[PDB]
Design a protein around this nucleic acid. Structure first.
Ligand SMILES: [Zn+2]
Ligand SMILES: [Zn+2]
Ligand SMILES: [Zn+2]
Ligand SMILES: [Zn+2]
Lengths: 296, 258, 278, 278, 258, 296
DNA sequence: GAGAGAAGCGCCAAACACA
DNA sequence: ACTGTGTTTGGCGCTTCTCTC
DNA sequence: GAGAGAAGCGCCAAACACA
DNA sequence: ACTGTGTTTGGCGCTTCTCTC
């Protein structure tokens, strides 16, 4: 077609629209490594030029632009996940997907983006489809999803408790029904970033959250991979109120494997920080049972 | 070029994939070269671990002081001709200049790391120092890379070799689990906190009167908005077609037009 | 008559109207005289600004500096990034090409690999060893105009800052070692101090999200030339030389034939506009 | 803690708030540190202006200058009036008290008799012959601070103007004699050229109606003293000295004890404010 | 003091009356000292007359070149060791530096004043030069004063004496007819012309923003009016009680308030 | 009393008034050289301080100030002239008179002086009394009178032709009735300064003036003292129109003393300039009679 | 009780030195 | 391509707070 | 014929050098 | 008392005038 910048301003936005519709055509890299190379290069160049153009000019976004880019993201990204195989496997369609992710991030974080126009274009279905992606076998995609969901949850105010309840349901399903999940560290990092922003006094829903879905996450076999994020979340949580620590102690003093195992080091390291932070302001309520069960 | 890049640094294959090299080209170059054929911390700069090492030279010896970050694995190493508490302090400070200030430091007992000099160095920076007696993997990685670099060229002053090894294992080798370099993982910004029951707002930047470099004019032309900022410049859209980097000597703050 | 009065006494403007003359005619009479423009040291030319990167690790500036400590004359080799301002510095005993190579590799290990580096025309930065080292890493090496110490303003200002911090340190502990002081200074500058105008540290800029891409540039220059009085940058003199005509001229300098056999590059600070003789 | 962080690293202001501190407290922490004020070359003091007459022939400034012409080194003795700006100048072969006396008498014959003359502390202006000559005419002779060449700004600027005119003249006729050139320059400056800001010649001001009388003055000075970092005007150094307390201070300078045995006068350009230790 | 003033210059009595001396004190001092007991031009600098003179010294000779203004009598003299057209040109230029540019110059014929060098000097300045062959009073006055100055002190370098004589007869001796010195009569401004059927208006001076010296302030405080002006200053009434001389670096022009 | 500046502003002008009335008391120096020295010094100091104060402050002059200062000038200056005696005689009351003259000059040339308030305080009687003073035997007083009358004639517009006619009458009286007058040079300088300011074409009154009162002034015995001013006036006059020169030539070619006398040099010098200026633009009408009468 | 002093806080132009 | 810059420092406006009639 | 280009004229901030 | 200053120079607004639709 044309470069998006070399046109008179009047119809300029129009051309942008066409460029988006020039990127919704699919090309499959896993079907065969060599197919439609010219069209693939055209798509890559178009995505690169659009992401370059979107971050240097103000007042380019307009009303008839939001649903089109939402649809483009939903077409390029929302898809069935590849068959599982447990160095990790890497998505073969990564160039175009990376370009789309960067485009969406730069768009959502523009200063001209209005936080009241996606309340009729980004609804609970968008959040559901974007949150079912955290089971990707590629870590770069998970990182991009984390840094996108953070911006979404920050900017919007009607999707907060919805996302929290959905995450609670995800945690329940992973802990009990199916044990095949690989995004339990990025979700935990987002959770910690959310938890640090509470006010006083703590709501009771957060206490239910801590006692029901954070602590039992210890009894899984594969806790070793995402231990740092969980420990960070716990230590960051219990600072807002120093009295609500005792349930954490008496819950950690049960899920401890009472036999010999290599998994002890995680519990010792976490207890180190929890004890460092709990010591001030007369904490001896459970020190005796803690040390008793620790001597074992 | 990947060929020269490997012939100079002996980096990995997943590293060469990031550059112009592709999967099978990287696999070809890797074995066509002769000499080639848990985490305790919670945040970057939370806990370090400090070792020492004898590196054997054919006519002398080197004492390597190595600190490793126990959340990303960022290595900082220094080579000395002896080992005392003075040189332990020198190594810790040279590491702080590279990585930042640790909150908690952990090291083995010995003649150093246990005197009053090292404890007085650690107490002026608010770094708590725990001692324990019996990571060792990165030490071996660094030693093997030194061996390779000496194998290719024997006339290396041991100061170039250490810097090239640190460059390779910090900025070039890609970790296998998260597909990130140690440097990238160690310096990527954390997520900002989120105020509850308060919309997370976008930051609004300031408005400037500006002038065009190389024109000698004496008139400030219109208040605009700054898109990006750096040291000694600012990205200003002079028109609605192009944007230019205006130095700070040609910029003057203003107030929103309303 | 105005023209003969000025040709005798070289009086000013406000004097030639008081003997019969329009203001513009007196202005032309003054602007045409060559003995009054060859000798007035006042001129008016645009100001030049150094080249800066479009993103971190694009352009670096390097330098060396002396430091007198405990009867020893240390040589500090300094390398500074132009986008963010991050500094790296190592102390050596003397100046040689091997020291330059080792210092550059220290800098690369600390910051990353740069695309272009531009330093002055020293005797250890133009050597064959240094050129071979730069070509071994795919690093372009350009130079500045000889005898123009203001074309490396950033790295010279950084030398000043670094030495000021070192003196503040040595004021307290006159027995402090040199490497400890340099390391503390580097930590302070890169991590603790905040830049004046953007209000972010050098480290926060160096490790910012690179997501903003490079704005496109244009190599189009001005297509016309003029006549210039000039001074040779090495030696300063009372009166200008010329005029001559420029062969070409880019932003910040101009190409002036100093002699008849060879030309030279002169910055926009040793040039003065002249009148077209035709 | 802010105070120990600065006591170790000497970081700035925007760094101490990012570790817990009010802005005013960080400002006090910086303004109190003596190693950071002893070494920063930046200061902020008021500007001084030379003493000027209240009417023509009240105060004069005198000087000598070299001029290299035809392998000979002429000494131009220059005397300039401060109210109107009228200049007088004579060329001699060498510098001696007799030459100074003859030049002063030339100036008196050309302009009139001055009340006060102030020159630098030269070896031919402080001699007994010159003092006796000045007392023979009832002319007061004061001096300036040694090694402060900006206290005679008017006469130095006039030397510059005079030499520029002489060079413009010698550009045309490299065989022109010296006295002719000096006389033409003096005529041009005093009678033909117009002052920049008041738009009258020096002669019109010198021979204006003296009817406006002298405004009354006041010798009242400031009654309080402070503490000052200082530099000795003769020798320049990296770091300030002190602090000390001023004995007295008039507009444009201050009395600082350089040593314990003797004091000295320092201008408001080599002084930096200090904090009161009590 | 009049006593020292006469003992140095040997000026007249009507001169001493201008100073602290009174009529009878001047009459006392005048004869208590041992050694003491028409106009052709129309405007100042209209016609000059130039003479030459041999001044006899006991071991050498001096050639005095003297120009006199034929409307006030302002004397300008120079002493040389020879006499040529070069020195006539030097004398004329040294006189122009003191008195101004004459419109018409008149002198006696001779080896000088009649060559091509002098006529070429006079033609570059637009001064017409008329020659005539046969004032002599002022020459004698100047010679007698030189005699007196040499009588009191014999070790005079002849350069101080000439300057003191010129000072005396130009700035000290009072003319008898108009009670004016030669300098005062020669440099007093003429009367400005008067436009007919047009009111002769008063000149209105400009308004300035100003600052106080020695205060380091950074605020221009109110537009005022300048009363008097000079080189490198201006008289500004800071209040309605006192007025101060503000340099030009602390003054900024403004526009009338209306 | 007090210093005029050290009082609060409200009554400040009032004190000024009193100071003026402290200067209208007369002290006679010719009666005896030593009398009322204290009061004389007080008067001198008061005049000096008032003239100092009047030239540094704006908006000091007010409506009830004009007639008082006019009366003060009329009391100090307007007086009978001393007996005549033909070095010249000098007024013994010169200090106070000089102070008064300087005060009046600084007052009249103030920028706050209004040129419409002395049309009811300075009338024809003021001009008459000030113009009868040009017969003073002291030259300094004549110089001050000249530089005062110049300012008066410049500032006022209703006293111009009156002053011109009065000067014509003075010239007639001097040339014919009485030959005792000593101010015929300052008046001529003022006349030349006035003449240079004419417009084109010349009015006929000015031609009558030139032909009747300027040219005959040559036939007086004491022309030698004020020849320069007269010659300057003539040469400055005839530049405005170059045709009206012939009457001047044929009038100068009669009053010439046809005998030998030292008075010839004045006529030769004047004819030199008149011939220098008349030569351009075909002037040969009277050249032959001029040279004929000149050869004699 | 209320309107004025007092302290906190940001912003800015002029200097200065590395060569 | 070739090309000066970054930091310090008192003053001043502007917002918030506290001691007195 | 009329409103826009073209020339004249004053004013001003930034440099520069004498030491 | 002790104490930097005066001149040059292109750019820019602001007033007056002239060549074209
Ligand atoms: Zn290899
Ligand atoms: Zn010239
Ligand atoms: Zn400090
Ligand atoms: Zn005598």
């Amino acid at each position: 077609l044309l470069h998006i910048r070399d046109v008179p301003p009047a119809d300029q936005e129009k051309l942008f629209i066409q460029k988006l519709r020039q990127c919704c055509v699919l090309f499959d890299f896993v079907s065969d490594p060599l197919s439609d190379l010219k069209w693939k290069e055209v798509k890559r160049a178009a995505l690169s030029e659009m992401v370059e153009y979107i971050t240097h000019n103000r007042n380019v976004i307009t009303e008839p632009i939001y649903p089109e880019v939402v649809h483009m993201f939903a077409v390029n990204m929302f898809r069935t996940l590849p068959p599982s195989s447990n160095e990790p496997t890497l998505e073969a369609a990564w160039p175009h997907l990376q370009l789309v992710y960067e485009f969406f991030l730069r768009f959502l974080e523009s200063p001209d983006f209005q936080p009241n126009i996606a309340k009729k274009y980004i609804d609970q279905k968008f959040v559901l489809q974007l949150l079912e992606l955290f089971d990707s076998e590629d870590p770069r995609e998970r990182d991009f999803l984390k840094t996108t969901l953070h911006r979404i949850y920050g900017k919007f105010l009607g999707l907060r408790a919805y996302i929290r309840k959905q995450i609670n349901n995800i945690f329940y399903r992973f802990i009990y029904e199916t044990e095949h999940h690989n995004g339990i560290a990025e979700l935990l990092e987002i959770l910690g970033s959310i938890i640090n922003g509470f006010a006083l006094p703590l709501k009771e829903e957060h206490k239910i959250f801590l006692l029901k879905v954070l602590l039992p996450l210890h009894k899984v076999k594969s806790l070793s991979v995402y231990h740092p994020q969980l420990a960070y979340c716990v230590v960051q949580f219990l600072e807002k109120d120093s009295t609500l620590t005792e349930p954490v102690v008496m819950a950690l003093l049960k899920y401890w494997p009472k036999t010999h195992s290599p998994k002890e080091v995680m519990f010792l390291n976490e207890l180190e920080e929890i004890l460092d932070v709990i010591e001030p302001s007369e904490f001896v309520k459970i020190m005796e049972p803690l040390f008793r069960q620790l001597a074992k | 070029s990947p060929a020269k890049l490997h012939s100079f640094t002996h980096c990995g294959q997943a590293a060469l994939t990031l550059h112009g090299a592709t999967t099978t080209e990287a696999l070809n170059i890797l074995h066509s070269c002769h000499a080639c054929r848990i985490r305790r911390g919670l945040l970057p700069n939370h806990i370090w671990q400090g070792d020492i090492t004898h590196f054997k030279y054919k006519n002398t010896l080197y004492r390597l002081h190595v600190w490793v970050d126990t959340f990303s694995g960022s290595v900082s190493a220094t080579h000395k001709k002896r080992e005392t508490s003075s040189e332990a302090i020198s190594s810790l400070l040279h590491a702080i200049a590279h990585l930042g200030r640790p909150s908690h430091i952990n090291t083995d007992n010995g003649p150093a790391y246990a005197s009053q000099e090292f404890q007085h160095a650690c107490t002026s920076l608010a770094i708590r120092h725990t001692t324990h007696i019996p990571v060792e993997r990165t030490n071996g990685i660094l030693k093997t890379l030194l061996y390779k670099y000496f194998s290719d060229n024997p006339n290396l002053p041991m100061d170039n070799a250490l810097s090239v090894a640190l460059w390779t294992i910090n900025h070039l080798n890609v970790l296998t689990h998260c597909q990130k370099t140690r440097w990238q993982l160690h310096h990527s910004p954390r997520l900002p906190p989120i105020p509850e029951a308060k919309p997370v707002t976008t930051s609004k930047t300031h408005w400037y009167y500006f002038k065009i470099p190389g024109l000698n004019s004496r008139q400030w032309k219109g208040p605009q908005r700054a898109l990006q900022e750096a040291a000694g410049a600012a990205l200003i859209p002079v028109s609605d077609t192009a944007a230019q980097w205006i130095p700070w000597k040609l910029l003057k703050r203003a107030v929103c037009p309303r």
